[PDB]
Design an enzyme around this catalytic site. Structure first.
Site, PDB file in Angstrom:
ATOM      1  CG  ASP A  33      21.063 -29.650  -4.116  1.00 30.35           C
ATOM      2  OD1 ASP A  33      21.617 -30.735  -3.859  1.00 30.35           O
ATOM      3  OD2 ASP A  33      20.817 -28.726  -3.220  1.00 30.35           O
ATOM      4  CG  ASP A 213      24.223 -33.516  -1.485  1.00 30.66           C
ATOM      5  OD1 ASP A 213      23.552 -32.782  -2.309  1.00 30.66           O
ATOM      6  OD2 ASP A 213      24.839 -33.079  -0.489  1.00 30.66           O
TER       7      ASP A 213
HETATM    8  C1  LIG Z   1      20.327 -29.669   4.725  1.00 32.06           C
HETATM    9  O1  LIG Z   1      20.782 -30.214   3.452  1.00 32.06           O
HETATM   10  C2  LIG Z   1      21.707 -29.594   2.772  1.00 32.06           C
HETATM   11  O2  LIG Z   1      22.224 -28.568   3.094  1.00 32.06           O
HETATM   12  C3  LIG Z   1      22.054 -30.381   1.517  1.00 32.06           C
HETATM   13  C4  LIG Z   1      22.432 -31.847   1.869  1.00 32.06           C
HETATM   14  C5  LIG Z   1      23.495 -31.979   2.891  1.00 32.06           C
HETATM   15  C6  LIG Z   1      23.223 -32.426   4.202  1.00 32.06           C
HETATM   16  C7  LIG Z   1      24.236 -32.545   5.141  1.00 32.06           C
HETATM   17  C8  LIG Z   1      25.544 -32.194   4.833  1.00 32.06           C
HETATM   18  C9  LIG Z   1      25.850 -31.799   3.515  1.00 32.06           C
HETATM   19  C10 LIG Z   1      24.834 -31.697   2.595  1.00 32.06           C
HETATM   20  C11 LIG Z   1      27.290 -31.576   3.125  1.00 32.06           C
HETATM   21  N1  LIG Z   1      27.547 -30.397   2.286  1.00 32.06           N
HETATM   22  C12 LIG Z   1      27.985 -29.259   2.738  1.00 32.06           C
HETATM   23  O3  LIG Z   1      28.103 -29.060   3.974  1.00 32.06           O
HETATM   24  C13 LIG Z   1      28.454 -28.203   1.772  1.00 32.06           C
HETATM   25  C14 LIG Z   1      27.799 -28.117   0.405  1.00 32.06           C
HETATM   26  N2  LIG Z   1      28.458 -27.075  -0.409  1.00 32.06           N
HETATM   27  C15 LIG Z   1      29.442 -27.352  -1.265  1.00 32.06           C
HETATM   28  O4  LIG Z   1      29.802 -28.496  -1.559  1.00 32.06           O
HETATM   29  C16 LIG Z   1      30.067 -26.098  -1.926  1.00 32.06           C
HETATM   30  N3  LIG Z   1      31.373 -26.445  -2.482  1.00 32.06           N
HETATM   31  C17 LIG Z   1      32.505 -25.825  -2.212  1.00 32.06           C
HETATM   32  O5  LIG Z   1      32.533 -24.821  -1.435  1.00 32.06           O
HETATM   33  C18 LIG Z   1      33.757 -26.264  -2.932  1.00 32.06           C
HETATM   34  C19 LIG Z   1      34.843 -26.710  -1.993  1.00 32.06           C
HETATM   35  C20 LIG Z   1      34.382 -27.690  -1.030  1.00 32.06           C
HETATM   36  C21 LIG Z   1      36.072 -27.188  -2.834  1.00 32.06           C
HETATM   37  C22 LIG Z   1      29.150 -25.428  -2.942  1.00 32.06           C
HETATM   38  C23 LIG Z   1      29.724 -24.143  -3.461  1.00 32.06           C
HETATM   39  C24 LIG Z   1      28.746 -26.386  -4.048  1.00 32.06           C
HETATM   40  C25 LIG Z   1      26.321 -27.792   0.487  1.00 32.06           C
HETATM   41  O6  LIG Z   1      25.841 -27.166   1.458  1.00 32.06           O
HETATM   42  N4  LIG Z   1      25.556 -28.180  -0.553  1.00 32.06           N
HETATM   43  C26 LIG Z   1      24.153 -27.826  -0.742  1.00 32.06           C
HETATM   44  C27 LIG Z   1      23.941 -27.042  -2.053  1.00 32.06           C
HETATM   45  C28 LIG Z   1      24.900 -25.879  -2.316  1.00 32.06           C
HETATM   46  C29 LIG Z   1      24.667 -25.254  -3.671  1.00 32.06           C
HETATM   47  C30 LIG Z   1      24.825 -24.828  -1.193  1.00 32.06           C
HETATM   48  P1  LIG Z   1      23.138 -29.332  -0.684  1.00 32.06           P
HETATM   49  O7  LIG Z   1      21.697 -28.996  -0.976  1.00 32.06           O
HETATM   50  O8  LIG Z   1      23.788 -30.355  -1.586  1.00 32.06           O
HETATM   51  O9  LIG Z   1      23.167 -29.750   0.850  1.00 32.06           O
END
Ligand SMILES: COC(=O)[C@@H]1Cc2cccc(c2)CNC(=O)C[C@H](NC(=O)[C@@H](NC(=O)CC(C)C)C(C)C)C(=O)N[C@@H](CC(C)C)P(=O)(O)O1
Ligand SMILES: *[C@H]1O[C@H](CO)[C@@H](O)[C@H](O)[C@@H]1O
Ligand SMILES: *[C@H]1O[C@H](CO)[C@@H](O)[C@H](O)[C@@H]1O
Length: 323
Positions: A33, A213
């Site tokens: 990630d 990301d």
């Molecule tokens: C504070 O940083 C984080 O949370 C970082 C960066 C970030 C920042 C702002 C907005 C997002 C992402 C924008 N991203 C988000 O708001 C959501 C993202 N989760 C997803 O994409 C989730 N995907 C789905 O549910 C599938 C759907 C959308 C068909 C997850 C299960 C992979 C997410 O939280 N990803 C984190 C990892 C995941 C395994 C929980 P990531 O570490 O990539 O997020």
């Protein structure tokens, strides 16, 4: 010097990408990630019922505690996890980090309690945003980077095919033409970059910033851009059971591109059909809202079109069309 190739594999619909990692001799399937900086694992400190369907880390066998240290992380989708900290040997693509901080889970939120495809996360954002308390720890990459041939990693994510994380070297066979680099702003711990303009099908507009990301499934943009894109898609409508704009699966979707330091990064419309939406007979779009946060999230939908080099020298990001 060290280098290696770690093989990733998408889950169904390319929701997430999983890569094996050996910790203290046990291999776990982790979600790499670039949007976070914690290496956390399912562990023997979880209730037994939550261990089922996973490979789990047993710190008692090989880990060295950091007495008094804890971790607690929260993600953009509202998921979370927390626990305590051990150092151990961590091997990725044949490259070993000795004394790497491994964040053993004691508590996991519902989303993680429902996902048996991964056994935790391996963060590749800058170590400044690692959540360990009272003092932050280094990511796998930061632990090993001065041992690598070059202090970089690079990513090829694919649609329904295995891909790679290249550590310490660039594989020029993974892209067409030459790389184009752009400067990274690491002030919030992310691989943040600027785009000078975008093209959403038949409409274009002004630039913005966003983050590379691997841990976000979709390409998340401002609501104004999302609206412009789906205005060109006949019959598109929001469906909250599916997670945003959906459309008939046979739709011919427009391309989406951004201008990055003079390079056009194009996502073909084929990649913007994420997959079946879930009840019934529509498909979910790969472009969706960023919830009004004021920057964009270049998640897996976008990354499937590119080879991306994450270079600590600069820092900087390199892009070229995937091959
Ligand atoms: C504070 O940083 C984080 O949370 C970082 C960066 C970030 C920042 C702002 C907005 C997002 C992402 C924008 N991203 C988000 O708001 C959501 C993202 N989760 C997803 O994409 C989730 N995907 C789905 O549910 C599938 C759907 C959308 C068909 C997850 C299960 C992979 C997410 O939280 N990803 C984190 C990892 C995941 C395994 C929980 P990531 O570490 O990539 O997020
Ligand atoms: C990555 O790069 C190192 C350094 O040249 C090699 O030793 C390794 O085999 C891989 O090609
Ligand atoms: C991951 O696995 C792929 C083959 O499945 C390799 O090509 C790669 O080097 C790594 O072993």
């Amino acid at each position: 010097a060290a280098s290696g190739v770690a093989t990733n594999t998408p889950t169904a619909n390319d929701e997430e990408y999983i890569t094996p990692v050996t910790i203290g001799g046990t291999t776990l399937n982790l979600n790499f990630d670039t949007g976070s900086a914690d290496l956390w694992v399912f562990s023997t400190e979880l209730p037994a019922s939550q261990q089922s369907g996973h490979s789990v880390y047993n710190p008692s066998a090989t880990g060295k505690e950091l007495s008094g240290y804890t971790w607690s992380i929260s993600y953009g989708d509202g998921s979370s996890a927390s626990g305590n900290v051990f150092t151990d040997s961590v091997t990725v693509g044949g490259v070993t980090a000795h004394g790497q901080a491994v964040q053993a889970a004691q508590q996991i939120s519902a989303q993680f309690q429902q996902d048996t495809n991964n056994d935790g996360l391996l963060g590749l954002a800058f170590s400044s945003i690692n959540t360990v308390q009272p003092q932050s720890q280094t990511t796998f990459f930061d632990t090993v980077k001065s041992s690598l041939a070059q202090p970089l990693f690079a990513v090829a994510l694919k649609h329904q095919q295995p891909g790679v994380y290249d550590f310490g070297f660039i594989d020029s066979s993974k892209y067409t033409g030459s790389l184009t680099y752009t400067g990274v702003d690491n002030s919030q711990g992310f691989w943040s970059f600027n785009v000078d303009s975008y093209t959403a099908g038949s409409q274009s507009g002004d630039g913005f910033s966003g983050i590379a990301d691997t841990g976000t499934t979709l390409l998340l943009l401002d609501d104004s851009v999302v609206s412009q894109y789906y205005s060109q898609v006949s019959g598109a409508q929001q469906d909250s059971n599916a997670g945003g704009y959906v459309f008939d699966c046979s739709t011919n979707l427009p391309d989406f591109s951004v201008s990055i330091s003079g390079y056009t990064a194009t996502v073909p419309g084929s990649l913007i059909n994420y997959g079946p939406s879930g009840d019934g007979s529509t498909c979910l779009g790969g472009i969706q809202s960023n919830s009004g946060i004021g920057f964009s999230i270049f998640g897996d939908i976008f990354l499937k079109s590119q080879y991306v080099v994450f270079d600590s020298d600069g820092p900087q990001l390199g892009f070229a069309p995937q091959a």
